[PDB]
Amino acid sequence: GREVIMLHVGQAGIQVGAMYWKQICAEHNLDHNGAPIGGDIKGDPDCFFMKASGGKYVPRALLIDLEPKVVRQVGNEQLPSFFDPKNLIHGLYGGANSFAKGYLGEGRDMIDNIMEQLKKEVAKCESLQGFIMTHAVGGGSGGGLGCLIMEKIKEEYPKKILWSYSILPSPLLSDAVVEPYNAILSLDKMIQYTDETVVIDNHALFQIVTKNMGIDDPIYDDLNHVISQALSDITASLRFKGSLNTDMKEFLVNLVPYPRSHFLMASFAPMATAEDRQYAKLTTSNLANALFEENYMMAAVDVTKGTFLACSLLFRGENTAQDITNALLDIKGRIKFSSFIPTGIKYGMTGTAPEGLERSGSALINHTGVAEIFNRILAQFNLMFDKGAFLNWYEIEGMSKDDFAGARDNVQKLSDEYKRDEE
Amino acid sequence: AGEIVCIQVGQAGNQIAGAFWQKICAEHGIDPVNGKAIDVVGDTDIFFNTIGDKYIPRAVVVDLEPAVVENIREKFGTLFDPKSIVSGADGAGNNFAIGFNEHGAETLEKVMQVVEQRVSETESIGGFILTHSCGGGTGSGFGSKILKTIRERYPKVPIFTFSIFPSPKISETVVEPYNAIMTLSNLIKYASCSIVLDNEALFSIAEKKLEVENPSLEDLNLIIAQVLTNVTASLRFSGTLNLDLGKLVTNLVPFSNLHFLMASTAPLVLAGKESYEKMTAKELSAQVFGDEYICAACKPTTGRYLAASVLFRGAVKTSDVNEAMATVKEQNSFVNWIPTGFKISKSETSPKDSALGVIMLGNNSEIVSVFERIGANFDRLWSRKAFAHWFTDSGFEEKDLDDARALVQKVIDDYRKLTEDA
Ligand SMILES: Nc1nc2c(ncn2[C@@H]2O[C@H](COP(=O)(O)OP(=O)(O)OP(=O)(O)O)[C@@H](O)[C@H]2O)c(=O)[nH]1
Ligand SMILES: Nc1nc2c(ncn2[C@@H]2O[C@H](COP(=O)(O)OP(=O)(O)OP(=O)(O)O)[C@@H](O)[C@H]2O)c(=O)[nH]1
């Protein structure tokens, strides 16, 4: 099998997913509505879709939310009839920017239907490789159900690999004053339960849309174009035959040198185009360089200053192996790698391309600068927690100060662990 | 899916809500009264039920007044469904305690049956909105037993209230303090949030900016209606931030017991439509955050904000908004360094009668000056007669007023402390 099941939780999770699924469909030449096959199917659709006897390919995905709106509009209007209608799951009341509801309040009841329906979905796989969850970190259902679901997955499926792809609370575009509280609670849960996770910061994403794409006044819908394309390259290696990353099991060997230091930053390039110029800079070396520059990094961290713990560059399309190899000579030595990790830059290439681009690529970077992101969130957490602001919106559902303190300390230890590798 | 049941209590509740309902009908393309679907837009379902070829305001109408509120029968007619209008055997005076005595239970249950129906027809309750005056036998005398009973039966459902405080003028019944403080007690104790609208502010705005020679009660109601309509708009027309009623409560109230909010709106336009309404984002922001337009009469330019949010309604340039809001942040300041304390959102639907409008809500510690005035009425009454002398038979016992003032003082004192500590 080597099948993968995707969970999308909360609004941001579901909308980013909806875009992912439109794009993955295009890559396989499978039609958006009704999931038909345009005669000639490309790649290996089995990684993400189930094959009906009527020829319909059904995306293996669950859209989950506490608020019965986003689930309804994607499953019935944006991609009508694409998703399996029994894998659309929703509650009746939303949370309200409160981790506590999604994790301990409404959501703790709903979790029995979530897990039963997942059980029905994994049971359809010839052999399941893992789960990939897409969610907002600092929201209500995103954070809360996301973390509840993750805990239950690890307990129920201990030997499958659990990845999460998640969106961090930049103060620049926020729907919640308490977002940092939800973030540190969610990050705590992830440290204890995921096997690998990719961190996208809306702050960075905003910078990219604003300056690389030339789009004034970014709205969430633009930020999600960048996300969707990046996410599409990350899982591309599981969709097309290729080298380097070819299985979730390899991802956990190459990109996570320590069981507790699995937070990855990601880059993606070319960021589609300016609608002028060219669709892509074709010089192999410009693409290779781009993946290590600050303008293509969705973390808002200059990776120049810090230590790389792992790096994996997946190239797609027309790039020649020898040119990439030559391009890497001017990258190693601009950047430093950990003395305790013999691994250098791993790279390879899958001979397909996103629709419309000659060549493109992405990179998963495990790097000490991730700590800066955690440290910004923790600083906000500390100013608010220390005066007791908004704690009543959590205690009212059962989450006392002791859990907040626990989460704070575990996230701080994570940050300290990464800081040591800078020496 | 997050729908809102609206409760209107007492004379003030009904006149104000009436104005609200007409305006909200206009914005969503529903003809008032003959609620036909004249190109209906927006998330209509939050405030109107839909039967088919009809749109019914999801409202509960409450009046202890004897007989019926023909004031609705004649002024709105088919706008409101008659099964939702509740009254009892007789009325009440200007005394809170009458709303709370003489078998008021008959109407409290009838009101609750109606509430149960507006709740049960709804897939999911996203909250209640309750509009009422604080100065009389029904507005608060009955309105506060409603507020209490609602939280008893729907404990997790947020109640957002709008309430009118009487003019400091003593032209009204002089038992007002006894009402006002018992009213605050229950608002502090049970509401999730409340907007404090002070008739003094509405009045001085009407005199100074809307050019009204001698503002009548019916003119003040329009300022209120414009504030209610615009404040509620973020819940009806989706914009750049995904806000709803529960989320507004969370973003503006960091502590229990400090949930009294100020409100301000601009341009403020009365039905006469005397002037052409076009402003830049910069002019509009400077006015909404000035003292001139604050409906609580509190001068929140000299104190400090604890949390706040601004919605722009209409087509406004993002560049201009950010410069305008930068100017604001330098003109005033915010408490405990809540790093996320100030939010800006936009939504494209133009509020009618204006090119661009702005709503500002805030939790600001100068709001206690309203509470200082109410307390002052008590301190004068009790320094002269510390006996609750209007309550010697069917009124409240001193212990009830003990409770009420204790709670009010905690509100005043906690605001003061938090501001000074930052
Ligand atoms: N990149 C991106 N970020 C988003 C998007 N939507 C929301 N965010 C961010 O996510 C935070 C909360 O996101 P939500 O998706 O609303 O979380 P939620 O679970 O739906 O929150 P609830 O509605 O209370 O359950 C926001 O404050 C933003 O920081 C989106 O579409 N794209
Ligand atoms: N801003 C505003 N103030 C109002 C309005 N209606 C009444 N008031 C003031 O509010 C107080 C009366 O409040 P209510 O509780 O509604 O009076 P009531 O209890 O209904 O009085 P009765 O009809 O005699 O039973 C007085 O001080 C009025 O000045 C209104 O629509 N808007």
XYZ file of C-alpha atoms in Angstrom, chain B residues 139-354:
216
model
C -35.678 47.666 31.869
C -33.673 46.339 34.758
C -36.255 45.366 37.288
C -37.273 42.623 34.945
C -34.319 42.612 32.671
C -32.022 41.487 35.420
C -34.116 38.505 36.349
C -33.960 37.564 32.740
C -30.209 37.956 32.696
C -29.957 35.714 35.671
C -32.338 33.065 34.479
C -30.719 32.828 31.078
C -27.361 32.016 32.607
C -28.933 29.524 34.852
C -30.456 27.551 31.950
C -27.781 28.199 29.304
C -24.548 28.322 31.284
C -22.106 28.066 28.456
C -23.885 30.478 26.126
C -22.427 33.961 26.225
C -24.670 36.917 27.012
C -23.635 40.181 25.493
C -25.629 43.110 26.655
C -26.269 46.604 25.668
C -27.558 48.781 28.364
C -28.596 52.339 28.858
C -27.675 54.279 31.883
C -29.936 57.102 32.814
C -28.801 60.682 32.637
C -27.164 61.852 35.843
C -30.115 64.188 35.770
C -32.456 63.473 38.665
C -35.501 64.353 36.575
C -36.146 60.621 36.646
C -37.417 58.752 39.668
C -35.073 59.344 42.574
C -34.992 55.633 43.373
C -32.645 55.252 40.460
C -29.582 54.370 42.517
C -31.410 51.523 44.092
C -32.034 50.326 40.576
C -28.727 51.151 39.064
C -26.675 49.374 41.590
C -28.767 46.274 41.660
C -28.602 46.329 37.897
C -24.844 46.560 37.888
C -24.649 43.786 40.389
C -26.312 41.431 38.090
C -24.479 42.663 35.032
C -21.075 42.189 36.697
C -22.150 38.868 38.015
C -23.760 37.295 34.942
C -23.048 39.016 31.651
C -20.123 38.095 29.532
C -19.770 41.591 28.246
C -21.700 44.756 28.197
C -21.637 48.020 26.354
C -22.131 50.930 28.628
C -24.074 53.641 26.903
C -24.638 56.747 28.995
C -27.435 59.059 27.979
C -25.223 61.961 28.892
C -22.837 61.018 26.142
C -25.508 60.441 23.579
C -26.947 63.738 24.516
C -23.834 65.789 24.237
C -22.963 64.164 20.958
C -26.344 65.061 19.586
C -25.908 68.623 20.713
C -22.364 69.129 19.534
C -21.826 67.039 16.417
C -25.193 66.133 14.986
C -26.414 69.722 15.335
C -29.597 68.914 17.192
C -31.079 71.948 18.938
C -32.703 70.069 21.712
C -32.219 66.359 21.453
C -35.299 64.317 22.054
C -35.347 60.809 23.287
C -36.160 59.664 19.794
C -32.993 61.265 18.467
C -30.753 59.624 20.975
C -32.172 56.300 19.968
C -30.713 56.732 16.532
C -27.194 57.101 17.811
C -27.739 53.964 19.743
C -29.128 52.185 16.777
C -26.181 53.110 14.655
C -23.803 51.767 17.331
C -25.726 48.525 17.682
C -25.957 48.051 13.952
C -22.303 48.672 13.295
C -21.046 46.765 16.328
C -23.093 43.788 15.318
C -21.939 44.017 11.703
C -18.771 42.037 12.240
C -21.028 39.132 13.016
C -23.016 39.442 9.845
C -20.772 40.380 6.992
C -17.646 38.286 6.881
C -14.479 40.354 6.772
C -10.720 39.928 7.137
C -10.771 38.419 10.633
C -13.062 35.529 11.387
C -14.840 36.955 14.389
C -18.075 35.878 16.009
C -19.870 36.695 19.233
C -17.992 34.269 21.429
C -14.717 35.384 20.034
C -15.461 39.020 20.650
C -16.038 38.235 24.251
C -12.707 36.492 24.502
C -10.699 39.189 22.770
C -11.963 42.128 24.757
C -12.310 40.774 28.303
C -9.102 39.616 29.946
C -10.395 39.261 33.403
C -13.710 38.366 34.786
C -15.356 41.394 36.264
C -13.663 43.847 33.907
C -15.993 43.329 30.996
C -17.557 46.656 30.680
C -16.788 48.048 27.250
C -16.896 51.440 25.659
C -18.221 51.972 22.198
C -17.818 54.611 19.561
C -18.846 54.958 15.963
C -18.363 57.380 13.142
C -19.484 59.149 11.057
C -22.564 59.392 13.129
C -25.526 60.210 10.950
C -29.117 61.038 11.873
C -32.138 60.382 9.653
C -32.262 63.995 8.468
C -29.214 63.324 6.257
C -28.196 66.980 6.442
C -24.577 66.479 5.288
C -22.671 64.551 2.646
C -20.650 61.826 4.333
C -17.125 61.279 2.990
C -14.032 61.116 5.151
C -10.539 59.735 4.758
C -9.350 56.863 6.899
C -7.135 59.244 8.832
C -9.879 61.681 9.752
C -12.186 58.889 10.626
C -9.751 57.123 12.916
C -8.823 60.278 14.751
C -12.462 60.929 15.503
C -13.492 57.487 16.564
C -10.753 57.402 19.217
C -11.226 60.902 20.420
C -13.192 61.807 23.448
C -15.820 63.540 21.415
C -17.575 60.442 20.257
C -17.377 58.090 23.205
C -20.770 56.807 24.200
C -19.770 56.116 27.752
C -18.868 59.771 28.483
C -15.570 58.668 29.939
C -12.773 60.567 28.255
C -10.674 57.480 27.357
C -7.876 59.594 26.091
C -6.471 60.195 29.477
C -6.634 56.645 30.832
C -5.326 53.500 29.286
C -6.841 50.684 27.247
C -6.645 47.106 28.220
C -7.986 45.636 24.958
C -9.590 47.063 21.875
C -10.729 46.365 18.316
C -11.662 48.403 15.260
C -13.698 47.364 12.266
C -13.773 49.416 9.136
C -16.954 49.100 7.161
C -16.555 50.121 3.535
C -13.839 50.317 0.978
C -10.784 51.815 2.598
C -7.171 51.636 1.546
C -5.000 49.345 3.671
C -2.075 51.704 3.447
C -4.123 54.554 4.896
C -5.540 52.405 7.612
C -2.199 51.351 8.864
C -0.868 54.861 8.953
C -4.000 56.085 10.691
C -3.780 53.361 13.285
C -0.132 53.975 13.890
C -1.054 57.536 14.739
C -3.616 56.316 17.208
C -1.151 54.042 18.961
C 1.121 56.943 19.605
C -1.726 59.144 20.896
C -2.880 56.765 23.656
C -1.516 53.603 25.360
C -2.253 49.983 26.490
C -2.050 48.068 29.795
C -0.089 44.980 31.036
C 1.510 44.954 27.686
C -1.005 42.527 26.318
C 1.014 42.154 23.121
C -1.986 41.152 21.106
C -4.313 43.664 22.664
C -5.298 45.720 19.624
C -7.040 44.304 16.554
C -7.961 45.905 13.202
C -10.336 44.263 10.742
C -12.047 45.217 7.507
C -15.254 44.276 5.705
C -16.367 45.635 2.356
C -20.071 46.240 2.804
C -20.681 49.940 3.147
C -22.967 50.886 5.986
C -25.759 52.784 4.270
C -25.820 56.553 4.522
C -22.046 56.699 4.554
